[PDB]
Amino acid sequence: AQSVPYGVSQIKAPALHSQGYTGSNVKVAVIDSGIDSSHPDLKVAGGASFVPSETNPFQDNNSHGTHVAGTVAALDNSIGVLGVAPSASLYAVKVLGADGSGQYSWIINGIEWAIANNMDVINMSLGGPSGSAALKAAVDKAVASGVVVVAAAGNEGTSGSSSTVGYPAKYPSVIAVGAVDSSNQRASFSSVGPELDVMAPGVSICSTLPGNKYGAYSGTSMASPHVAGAAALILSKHPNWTNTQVRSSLENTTTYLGDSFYYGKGLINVQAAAQ
Ligand SMILES: [Ca+2]
Ligand SMILES: [Ca+2]
């Protein structure tokens, strides 16, 4: 029994699936706590680990990386769920440990491994409250090298009239993603600010969990992978397009929801975006 998560339908991915665009050959690096490659519903092409104590990227001792990955590429078969890009080449770049945290050096190292290894799209469902020249260095270089870089905007909510979008999501070169529910309302925890680009489903997102399980989670970490997936579908239909063009498309065919400070350019529509 294969269940199609609401979010995958909400961003109109199945329309592209029916046409034959499912992300084939598009490499997507999931920079997270690793991905359980043994999960029947995910096919992991490769990766690397930068957590000195957890050298196996195919071992997810946290569960977060696996869930994010499921939303990106859960296989289209007879079981579990269905990712936004079920045919994408899933790369596990493990930079976060068992408890969920990592050092910036580990994270940066992973971003750099992805650039070095020709990733097409990088997904970062993580953010820090403070930045660094080396972090900005890493993301700016990825984009300059053709990579589409996507990141969760953060779960800080609202604070006066100030931005709560964390890094690397804050940098202009990075696609900052907010979380909306099934009724398109902004999640109360979703970070706000002028750096917000788009919104995607982020509440009660059903996905893959370590040890052949499935569970729902809420957070902008669940939102970012939908847009990361969206990029893969667009790239599968238009392999010749640059990351700039892909981004433009995602941002210019959205469904406006409210003020950009809280919803960015709005909810993404991959059917419109893929042209
Ligand atoms: Ca499945
Ligand atoms: Ca940004």
mmCIF file of C-alpha atoms and ligand atoms in Angstrom:
data_model
loop_
_atom_site.group_PDB
_atom_site.id
_atom_site.type_symbol
_atom_site.label_atom_id
_atom_site.label_comp_id
_atom_site.label_asym_id
_atom_site.label_seq_id
_atom_site.Cartn_x
_atom_site.Cartn_y
_atom_site.Cartn_z
ATOM 1 C CA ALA A 1 0.000 0.000 0.000
ATOM 2 C CA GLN A 2 1.678 3.212 -1.209
ATOM 3 C CA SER A 3 0.373 6.459 0.350
ATOM 4 C CA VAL A 4 1.050 9.795 -1.416
ATOM 5 C CA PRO A 5 1.895 12.381 1.314
ATOM 6 C CA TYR A 6 -0.415 15.487 1.119
ATOM 7 C CA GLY A 7 2.535 17.813 0.562
ATOM 8 C CA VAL A 8 3.633 16.008 -2.588
ATOM 9 C CA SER A 9 0.103 16.599 -4.026
ATOM 10 C CA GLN A 10 -0.058 20.125 -2.499
ATOM 11 C CA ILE A 11 2.938 21.264 -4.635
ATOM 12 C CA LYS A 12 1.525 19.478 -7.725
ATOM 13 C CA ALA A 13 4.372 16.943 -8.207
ATOM 14 C CA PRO A 14 2.184 13.966 -9.316
ATOM 15 C CA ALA A 15 1.204 15.968 -12.427
ATOM 16 C CA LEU A 16 4.855 15.793 -13.579
ATOM 17 C CA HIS A 17 5.164 12.126 -12.489
ATOM 18 C CA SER A 18 2.303 11.190 -14.852
ATOM 19 C CA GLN A 19 4.164 12.938 -17.742
ATOM 20 C CA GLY A 20 7.346 10.981 -17.057
ATOM 21 C CA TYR A 21 9.347 13.674 -15.212
ATOM 22 C CA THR A 22 10.422 12.169 -11.850
ATOM 23 C CA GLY A 23 13.984 13.508 -11.456
ATOM 24 C CA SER A 24 16.041 10.750 -13.206
ATOM 25 C CA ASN A 25 19.821 11.408 -13.190
ATOM 26 C CA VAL A 26 19.358 14.524 -11.068
ATOM 27 C CA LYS A 27 21.718 14.201 -8.117
ATOM 28 C CA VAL A 28 20.445 15.605 -4.830
ATOM 29 C CA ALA A 29 22.731 15.838 -1.815
ATOM 30 C CA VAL A 30 20.878 15.540 1.504
ATOM 31 C CA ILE A 31 23.351 17.359 3.878
ATOM 32 C CA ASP A 32 21.901 15.977 7.145
ATOM 33 C CA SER A 33 22.256 13.300 9.916
ATOM 34 C CA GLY A 34 22.835 10.609 7.267
ATOM 35 C CA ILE A 35 20.274 8.379 5.478
ATOM 36 C CA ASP A 36 19.349 4.816 6.438
ATOM 37 C CA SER A 37 20.133 3.170 3.068
ATOM 38 C CA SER A 38 18.595 -0.097 4.241
ATOM 39 C CA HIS A 39 15.078 1.414 4.148
ATOM 40 C CA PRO A 40 13.050 -0.539 1.530
ATOM 41 C CA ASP A 41 11.504 2.752 0.247
ATOM 42 C CA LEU A 42 14.681 4.706 -0.473
ATOM 43 C CA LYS A 43 17.532 4.022 -2.870
ATOM 44 C CA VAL A 44 20.749 5.843 -1.809
ATOM 45 C CA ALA A 45 23.357 6.196 -4.589
ATOM 46 C CA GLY A 46 26.253 7.309 -2.352
ATOM 47 C CA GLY A 47 27.572 9.883 0.112
ATOM 48 C CA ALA A 48 30.245 10.622 2.706
ATOM 49 C CA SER A 49 30.392 11.312 6.440
ATOM 50 C CA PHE A 50 32.099 14.263 8.113
ATOM 51 C CA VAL A 51 31.067 13.387 11.665
ATOM 52 C CA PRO A 52 34.414 11.982 13.067
ATOM 53 C CA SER A 53 32.496 9.717 15.499
ATOM 54 C CA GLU A 54 29.932 8.489 12.898
ATOM 55 C CA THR A 55 31.915 7.665 9.724
ATOM 56 C CA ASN A 56 29.008 5.812 8.091
ATOM 57 C CA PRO A 57 26.695 8.187 6.124
ATOM 58 C CA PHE A 58 24.285 5.257 5.449
ATOM 59 C CA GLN A 59 23.613 4.978 9.211
ATOM 60 C CA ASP A 60 21.113 7.485 10.548
ATOM 61 C CA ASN A 61 21.220 7.478 14.345
ATOM 62 C CA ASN A 62 18.995 10.553 14.596
ATOM 63 C CA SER A 63 16.145 9.882 12.053
ATOM 64 C CA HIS A 64 15.966 13.502 10.710
ATOM 65 C CA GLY A 65 18.134 12.887 7.626
ATOM 66 C CA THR A 66 16.081 9.845 6.648
ATOM 67 C CA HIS A 67 12.772 11.724 6.940
ATOM 68 C CA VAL A 68 14.070 14.662 4.924
ATOM 69 C CA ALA A 69 15.410 12.185 2.297
ATOM 70 C CA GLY A 70 12.026 10.380 2.099
ATOM 71 C CA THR A 71 10.261 13.654 1.257
ATOM 72 C CA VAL A 72 12.883 14.178 -1.444
ATOM 73 C CA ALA A 73 13.052 10.696 -3.019
ATOM 74 C CA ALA A 74 10.826 8.001 -1.444
ATOM 75 C CA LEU A 75 10.546 5.418 -4.306
ATOM 76 C CA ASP A 76 7.428 5.043 -6.519
ATOM 77 C CA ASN A 77 6.457 1.389 -5.893
ATOM 78 C CA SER A 78 3.786 -0.578 -3.949
ATOM 79 C CA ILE A 79 4.804 0.392 -0.380
ATOM 80 C CA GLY A 80 5.416 3.304 1.998
ATOM 81 C CA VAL A 81 5.413 6.874 0.661
ATOM 82 C CA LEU A 82 6.262 8.798 -2.528
ATOM 83 C CA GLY A 83 8.875 11.529 -2.755
ATOM 84 C CA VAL A 84 8.700 14.690 -4.830
ATOM 85 C CA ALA A 85 11.461 13.206 -7.095
ATOM 86 C CA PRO A 86 11.285 9.364 -6.712
ATOM 87 C CA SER A 87 13.883 8.799 -9.401
ATOM 88 C CA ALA A 88 16.525 11.241 -8.183
ATOM 89 C CA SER A 89 20.044 10.076 -7.212
ATOM 90 C CA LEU A 90 20.021 10.429 -3.402
ATOM 91 C CA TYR A 91 23.386 11.325 -1.742
ATOM 92 C CA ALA A 92 23.829 11.050 2.040
ATOM 93 C CA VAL A 93 26.260 13.814 3.204
ATOM 94 C CA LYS A 94 26.221 13.218 6.966
ATOM 95 C CA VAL A 95 27.330 16.257 8.973
ATOM 96 C CA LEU A 96 25.083 15.903 12.033
ATOM 97 C CA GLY A 97 25.476 13.349 14.825
ATOM 98 C CA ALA A 98 23.078 11.118 16.760
ATOM 99 C CA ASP A 99 21.733 13.912 18.990
ATOM 100 C CA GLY A 100 21.054 16.112 15.968
ATOM 101 C CA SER A 101 23.885 18.695 16.223
ATOM 102 C CA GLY A 102 27.090 19.152 14.222
ATOM 103 C CA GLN A 103 30.068 21.563 14.139
ATOM 104 C CA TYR A 104 30.123 24.230 11.369
ATOM 105 C CA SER A 105 33.428 22.812 10.085
ATOM 106 C CA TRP A 106 31.633 19.437 9.544
ATOM 107 C CA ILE A 107 28.720 21.147 7.720
ATOM 108 C CA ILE A 108 30.995 23.328 5.569
ATOM 109 C CA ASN A 109 33.181 20.304 4.777
ATOM 110 C CA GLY A 110 30.057 18.500 3.474
ATOM 111 C CA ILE A 111 28.920 21.448 1.326
ATOM 112 C CA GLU A 112 32.424 21.474 -0.193
ATOM 113 C CA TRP A 113 32.369 17.691 -0.813
ATOM 114 C CA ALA A 114 29.070 18.225 -2.711
ATOM 115 C CA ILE A 115 30.539 20.959 -4.964
ATOM 116 C CA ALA A 116 33.599 18.778 -5.607
ATOM 117 C CA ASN A 117 31.342 15.831 -6.507
ATOM 118 C CA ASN A 118 28.986 17.515 -9.031
ATOM 119 C CA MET A 119 25.756 17.611 -7.008
ATOM 120 C CA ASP A 120 22.922 19.322 -8.875
ATOM 121 C CA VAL A 121 20.852 20.267 -5.802
ATOM 122 C CA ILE A 122 21.861 20.543 -2.163
ATOM 123 C CA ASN A 123 19.272 20.446 0.624
ATOM 124 C CA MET A 124 20.061 21.864 4.020
ATOM 125 C CA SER A 125 17.376 21.215 6.602
ATOM 126 C CA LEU A 126 19.414 22.892 9.301
ATOM 127 C CA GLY A 127 20.503 26.373 10.318
ATOM 128 C CA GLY A 128 22.477 28.273 12.908
ATOM 129 C CA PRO A 129 21.618 31.648 14.460
ATOM 130 C CA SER A 130 25.039 32.997 13.442
ATOM 131 C CA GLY A 131 27.023 32.939 10.171
ATOM 132 C CA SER A 132 30.636 32.844 8.975
ATOM 133 C CA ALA A 133 32.785 34.002 6.066
ATOM 134 C CA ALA A 134 33.634 30.293 5.465
ATOM 135 C CA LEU A 135 29.936 29.308 5.457
ATOM 136 C CA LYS A 136 29.060 32.170 3.075
ATOM 137 C CA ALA A 137 32.147 31.091 1.107
ATOM 138 C CA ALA A 138 30.831 27.504 0.751
ATOM 139 C CA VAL A 139 27.272 28.382 -0.413
ATOM 140 C CA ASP A 140 28.368 31.204 -2.774
ATOM 141 C CA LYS A 141 30.866 28.844 -4.398
ATOM 142 C CA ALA A 142 28.224 26.083 -4.834
ATOM 143 C CA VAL A 143 25.862 28.468 -6.679
ATOM 144 C CA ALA A 144 28.770 29.928 -8.743
ATOM 145 C CA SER A 145 29.527 26.327 -9.741
ATOM 146 C CA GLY A 146 25.965 25.675 -10.922
ATOM 147 C CA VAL A 147 24.442 23.997 -7.869
ATOM 148 C CA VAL A 148 20.918 24.733 -6.709
ATOM 149 C CA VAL A 149 21.217 25.296 -2.937
ATOM 150 C CA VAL A 150 18.066 24.955 -0.812
ATOM 151 C CA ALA A 151 17.719 25.446 2.992
ATOM 152 C CA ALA A 152 15.104 25.470 5.756
ATOM 153 C CA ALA A 153 14.401 29.073 6.857
ATOM 154 C CA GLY A 154 14.234 28.084 10.538
ATOM 155 C CA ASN A 155 11.647 27.568 13.279
ATOM 156 C CA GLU A 156 12.020 30.839 15.191
ATOM 157 C CA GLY A 157 8.639 32.350 14.339
ATOM 158 C CA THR A 158 8.068 36.089 14.716
ATOM 159 C CA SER A 159 10.025 38.566 16.845
ATOM 160 C CA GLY A 160 8.960 42.244 16.698
ATOM 161 C CA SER A 161 9.837 43.492 13.221
ATOM 162 C CA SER A 162 13.111 41.556 12.935
ATOM 163 C CA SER A 163 14.125 38.630 10.738
ATOM 164 C CA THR A 164 14.442 35.236 12.421
ATOM 165 C CA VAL A 165 15.713 33.428 9.252
ATOM 166 C CA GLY A 166 18.880 31.553 10.188
ATOM 167 C CA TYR A 167 21.973 30.690 8.166
ATOM 168 C CA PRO A 168 22.843 29.479 5.568
ATOM 169 C CA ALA A 169 19.197 30.197 4.579
ATOM 170 C CA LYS A 170 19.865 33.945 5.162
ATOM 171 C CA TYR A 171 22.440 34.357 2.366
ATOM 172 C CA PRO A 172 20.990 35.697 -0.949
ATOM 173 C CA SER A 173 22.500 32.827 -2.987
ATOM 174 C CA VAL A 174 20.499 30.231 -0.909
ATOM 175 C CA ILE A 175 16.798 29.408 -1.352
ATOM 176 C CA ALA A 176 15.147 30.022 2.055
ATOM 177 C CA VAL A 177 12.025 27.938 2.654
ATOM 178 C CA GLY A 178 9.100 28.553 5.001
ATOM 179 C CA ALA A 179 6.504 26.093 6.234
ATOM 180 C CA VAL A 180 2.739 26.246 5.490
ATOM 181 C CA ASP A 181 0.076 23.670 6.506
ATOM 182 C CA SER A 182 -2.439 21.829 4.244
ATOM 183 C CA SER A 183 -4.730 24.879 4.416
ATOM 184 C CA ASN A 184 -1.876 27.098 3.117
ATOM 185 C CA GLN A 185 -1.638 29.040 6.386
ATOM 186 C CA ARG A 186 1.887 29.868 7.616
ATOM 187 C CA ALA A 187 3.046 27.566 10.481
ATOM 188 C CA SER A 188 3.402 29.643 13.706
ATOM 189 C CA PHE A 189 6.962 28.323 14.240
ATOM 190 C CA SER A 190 8.070 29.207 10.624
ATOM 191 C CA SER A 191 10.833 31.842 10.457
ATOM 192 C CA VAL A 192 10.076 35.263 9.018
ATOM 193 C CA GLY A 193 11.961 38.046 7.313
ATOM 194 C CA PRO A 194 12.806 39.644 3.894
ATOM 195 C CA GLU A 195 15.170 36.743 3.058
ATOM 196 C CA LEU A 196 12.238 34.287 2.815
ATOM 197 C CA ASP A 197 11.881 33.001 -0.810
ATOM 198 C CA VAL A 198 9.134 30.375 -0.881
ATOM 199 C CA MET A 199 6.848 28.241 1.282
ATOM 200 C CA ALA A 200 6.162 24.533 1.143
ATOM 201 C CA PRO A 201 4.223 22.031 3.252
ATOM 202 C CA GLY A 202 5.872 21.736 6.676
ATOM 203 C CA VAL A 203 3.327 20.372 9.186
ATOM 204 C CA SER A 204 2.692 16.722 10.023
ATOM 205 C CA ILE A 205 4.755 15.645 7.002
ATOM 206 C CA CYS A 206 4.636 11.878 6.641
ATOM 207 C CA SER A 207 7.939 10.276 5.588
ATOM 208 C CA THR A 208 10.493 7.468 5.958
ATOM 209 C CA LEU A 209 12.141 6.743 9.337
ATOM 210 C CA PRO A 210 15.128 4.439 10.157
ATOM 211 C CA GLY A 211 14.519 0.708 10.409
ATOM 212 C CA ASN A 212 11.758 0.396 7.802
ATOM 213 C CA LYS A 213 9.310 2.761 9.611
ATOM 214 C CA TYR A 214 7.228 5.861 8.755
ATOM 215 C CA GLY A 215 6.307 8.887 10.840
ATOM 216 C CA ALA A 216 5.099 12.476 10.651
ATOM 217 C CA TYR A 217 7.208 15.523 11.659
ATOM 218 C CA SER A 218 6.653 19.323 11.545
ATOM 219 C CA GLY A 219 9.301 21.950 10.924
ATOM 220 C CA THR A 220 10.721 23.977 8.079
ATOM 221 C CA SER A 221 13.160 21.005 7.771
ATOM 222 C CA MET A 222 10.206 19.140 6.236
ATOM 223 C CA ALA A 223 9.432 22.128 3.938
ATOM 224 C CA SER A 224 12.870 22.573 2.326
ATOM 225 C CA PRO A 225 13.027 19.001 0.836
ATOM 226 C CA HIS A 226 9.789 19.659 -1.129
ATOM 227 C CA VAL A 227 11.492 22.597 -2.914
ATOM 228 C CA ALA A 228 14.725 20.537 -3.219
ATOM 229 C CA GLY A 229 12.540 17.907 -4.930
ATOM 230 C CA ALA A 230 10.802 20.526 -7.057
ATOM 231 C CA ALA A 231 14.241 21.575 -8.390
ATOM 232 C CA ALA A 232 14.935 17.939 -9.393
ATOM 233 C CA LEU A 233 11.706 17.618 -11.408
ATOM 234 C CA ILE A 234 12.403 20.904 -13.211
ATOM 235 C CA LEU A 235 15.984 19.811 -13.907
ATOM 236 C CA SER A 236 14.708 16.471 -15.272
ATOM 237 C CA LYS A 237 12.403 18.228 -17.753
ATOM 238 C CA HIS A 238 14.922 21.002 -18.549
ATOM 239 C CA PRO A 239 18.441 19.518 -18.058
ATOM 240 C CA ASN A 240 19.957 22.506 -19.894
ATOM 241 C CA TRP A 241 18.653 25.171 -17.439
ATOM 242 C CA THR A 242 20.992 26.889 -14.989
ATOM 243 C CA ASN A 243 20.427 27.053 -11.222
ATOM 244 C CA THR A 244 19.501 30.774 -11.685
ATOM 245 C CA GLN A 245 16.766 29.857 -14.176
ATOM 246 C CA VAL A 246 15.485 26.998 -11.996
ATOM 247 C CA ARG A 247 15.270 29.403 -9.019
ATOM 248 C CA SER A 248 13.576 32.114 -11.089
ATOM 249 C CA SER A 249 10.953 29.598 -12.236
ATOM 250 C CA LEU A 250 10.197 28.353 -8.715
ATOM 251 C CA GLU A 251 9.853 31.959 -7.464
ATOM 252 C CA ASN A 252 7.892 33.387 -10.361
ATOM 253 C CA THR A 253 5.081 30.764 -10.636
ATOM 254 C CA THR A 254 4.091 30.641 -6.963
ATOM 255 C CA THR A 255 0.626 31.016 -5.480
ATOM 256 C CA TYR A 256 0.749 34.315 -3.496
ATOM 257 C CA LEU A 257 -0.465 33.698 0.066
ATOM 258 C CA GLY A 258 0.302 36.875 1.996
ATOM 259 C CA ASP A 259 2.971 39.474 2.728
ATOM 260 C CA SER A 260 6.440 38.337 1.509
ATOM 261 C CA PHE A 261 7.964 38.943 5.000
ATOM 262 C CA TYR A 262 5.924 35.930 6.297
ATOM 263 C CA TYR A 263 5.264 33.866 3.065
ATOM 264 C CA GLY A 264 8.083 34.963 0.760
ATOM 265 C CA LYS A 265 6.950 34.803 -2.849
ATOM 266 C CA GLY A 266 4.355 32.208 -1.745
ATOM 267 C CA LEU A 267 3.561 28.487 -2.082
ATOM 268 C CA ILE A 268 5.474 26.691 -4.832
ATOM 269 C CA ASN A 269 3.761 25.067 -7.844
ATOM 270 C CA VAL A 270 6.141 22.639 -9.638
ATOM 271 C CA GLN A 271 3.671 22.000 -12.492
ATOM 272 C CA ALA A 272 3.856 25.729 -13.441
ATOM 273 C CA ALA A 273 7.564 25.938 -12.582
ATOM 274 C CA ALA A 274 8.599 23.061 -14.897
ATOM 275 C CA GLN A 275 6.993 24.653 -17.980
HETATM 276 CA CA CA B 1 6.885 4.067 -1.889
HETATM 277 CA CA CA B 2 18.682 33.170 1.086
#
